[PDB]
Antibody, heavy 217, light 213 residues
Framework: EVQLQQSGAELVKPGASVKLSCTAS????????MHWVKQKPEQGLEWIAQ????????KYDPKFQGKATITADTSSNTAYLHLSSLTSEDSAVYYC????????????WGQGTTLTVSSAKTTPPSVYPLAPGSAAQTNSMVTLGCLVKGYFPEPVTVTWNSGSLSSGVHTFPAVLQSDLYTLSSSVTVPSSTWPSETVTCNVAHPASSTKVDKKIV | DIVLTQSPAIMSASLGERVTMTCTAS???????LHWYQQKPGSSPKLWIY???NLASGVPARFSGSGSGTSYSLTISSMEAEDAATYYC?????????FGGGTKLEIKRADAAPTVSIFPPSSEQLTSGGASVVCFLNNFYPKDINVKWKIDGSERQNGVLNSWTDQDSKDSTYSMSSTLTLTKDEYERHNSYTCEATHKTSTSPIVKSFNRN
């Protein structure tokens, strides 16, 4: 019955500010302590601040002091986190957490809210087919690839043969290159089926509502 | 600031194996204010063990925690696949509340060499005046690997972007992709492109190259 619902993913421009929310259900936040935790990509968890929704008393971690402001509205049973003068180092996932009055039972953490700080505009991905330059890469079998360059924002969907090929597939995590994302997906198939049967990679970029198909030769 | 140090940062273990990880504080805390969290990729941190040794709701019996003062530890009697995750100890004793760097627990398996593949740029990509050479190093173990790019026997480190996947969910292997990005120009002014990789699995650096055309 206990649950913390957080506001949706956020995309913001550097210099701006944003206000995240964490609404508690199944329990009154007045009887507890609310916390906001930040987790950078691949980094560790960092406690930011705490507040007593009962008296508004707040505690901050010095490095966040000034940049972050924690508040709470017991009437709506909600806790907020305001971040100002955003920069890329503010990009991370933010979790709100309730210090339980009874640890034993219940998941007192929120799902988290992603905050991405970029000045980049929605940009469809440039899809480039990757074919083997004629060379025995591995005994018989072969490996193909697709390069998805310069797109924004994440994510994109990379399927092979629309789905008929979901074996031996390796899609690598996107990586930032000049404010845009780049990613690559490889596909392994027995030397017997290629170039026999045709192989296409299907990329889809929701944000740009574009879907490309690239055949490999 | 009470500093929490977790050790080791990354550890591997086969299933059925007993596992112990530690967490030491720079200064003493109440065993009641030390908690462990489990976090799996994409999901939010979950309370695993609270107050040093109490299992949270829904936590398997093969898990146990011990300690007091400045030394704590989390133990898994028999490791299972679903146990692979990252574990964080946390002290809610004296603010600012801290977290340890966490210990990433991975599934150990037999060593495996990477199967390399070098890929020349794309005609289509060349048409735009850009050129990216991609190298795939798939299904290997351990994760430790060192890739190097050689353009005409010369080492090139400018324009390289690497990316690794997580331990495979099925065969518990790792994969990595490395991309070297140049211009139509400075790429067309070199002949040999080399993708070199040294893995525990070999003292002889694995090489995959190609010449223009």
């Amino acid at each position: 019955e206990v649950q913390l619902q957080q506001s949706g993913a956020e995309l913001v421009k550097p210099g701006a500010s944003v206000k995240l929310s964490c609404t508690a259900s199944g329990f009154n936040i007045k009887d507890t302590y609310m916390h906001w935790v930040k987790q950078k990509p691949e980094q560790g968890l960092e406690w930011i601040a705490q507040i007593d929704p009962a008296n508004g008393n707040t505690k901050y971690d010095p490095k966040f002091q000034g940049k972050a402001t924690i508040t709470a509205d017991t009437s709506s049973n909600t806790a907020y986190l305001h971040l100002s003068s955003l920069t890329s180092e503010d990009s991370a996932v933010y979790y709100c957490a309730a210090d339980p009055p009874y640890y034993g039972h219940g998941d007192y953490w929120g799902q988290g809210t992603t905050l991405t700080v970029s000045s980049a505009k929605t940009t469809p991905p440039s899809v480039y087919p990757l074919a083997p330059g004629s060379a025995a890469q591995t005994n018989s079998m072969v490996t193909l690839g697709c390069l998805v360059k310069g797109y924004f924002p994440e994510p994109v969907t990379v399927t092979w043969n629309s789905g008929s090929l979901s074996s031996g597939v390796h899609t690598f995590p996107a990586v930032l290159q000049s404010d845009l994302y780049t990613l690559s997906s490889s596909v392994t198939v027995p030397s017997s089926t290629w170039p026999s049967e045709t192989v296409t990679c299907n990329v889809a970029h929701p944000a740009s509502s574009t879907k490309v198909d690239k055949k490999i030769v | 600031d009470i500093v929490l140090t977790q050790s080791p940062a990354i550890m591997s273990a086969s299933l059925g194996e007993r596992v112990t990880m530690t967490c030491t504080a720079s200064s003493s805390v109440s065993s009641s204010n030390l908690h462990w969290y489990q976090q799996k990729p994409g999901s939010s941190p979950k309370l695993w063990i609270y107050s040093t040794s109490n299992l949270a709701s829904g936590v398997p019996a093969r898990f146990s925690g011990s300690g007091s003062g400045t030394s704590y530890s989390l133990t898994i009697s028999s490791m299972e696949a679903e146990d692979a995750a990252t574990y964080y100890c946390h002290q809610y004793h004296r603010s600012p509340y801290t977290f340890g760097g966490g210990t990433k627990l991975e599934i150990k398996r037999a060593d495996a060499a990477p199967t390399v593949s070098i890929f020349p740029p794309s005609s289509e990509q060349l048409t735009s005046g850009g050129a990216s050479v991609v190298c795939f190093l798939n299904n290997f173990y351990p994760k430790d690997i060192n890739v190097k790019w050689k353009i005409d026997g010369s080492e090139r480190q400018n324009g390289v972007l690497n990316s690794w996947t997580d331990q495979d969910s099925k065969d518990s292997t790792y994969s990595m992709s490395s991309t070297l990005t140049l211009t139509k120009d400075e790429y067309e002014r070199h002949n040999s492109y080399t993708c070199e990789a040294t893995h525990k699995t070999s003292t002889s650096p694995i090489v995959k190259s190609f010449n223009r055309n």
